[PDB]
Amino acid sequence: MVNWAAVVDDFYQELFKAHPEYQNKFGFKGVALGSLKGNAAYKTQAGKTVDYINAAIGGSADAAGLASRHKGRNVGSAEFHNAKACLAKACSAHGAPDLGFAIDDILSHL
Ligand code: HEM
Instruction: Using the Cα atoms of residue 80, residue 86, residue 87 and residue 92 in order, give the sign of their dihedral.
Output: positive
- Residue 70 Cα to ligand 1 midpoint, Å, equals 6
Atom of ligand 1 nearest to the CA of 103: 1
Q: Which experimental approach was used here?
A: X-ray
Based on the number of CB atoms within 10 Å of its own CB, is 54 exposed (0-12), middle (13-18) or buried (19 or more)?
A: middle
Based on the number of CB atoms within 10 Å of its own CB, is 106 exposed (0-12), middle (13-18) or buried (19 or more)?
A: buried
Which residue minimizes the CA distance to atom 30 of ligand 1?
22
Based on the number of CB atoms within 10 Å of its own CB, is 2 exposed (0-12), middle (13-18) or buried (19 or more)?
A: middle
CA separation for the pair 55, 44 (Å, rounded): 16
- For 1-110, CATH number out of 1.10.490.10, 3.40.50.2300, 3.30.365.10, 1.10.1670.10 equals 1.10.490.10
- Residue 93 Cα to ligand 1 midpoint, Å, equals 21
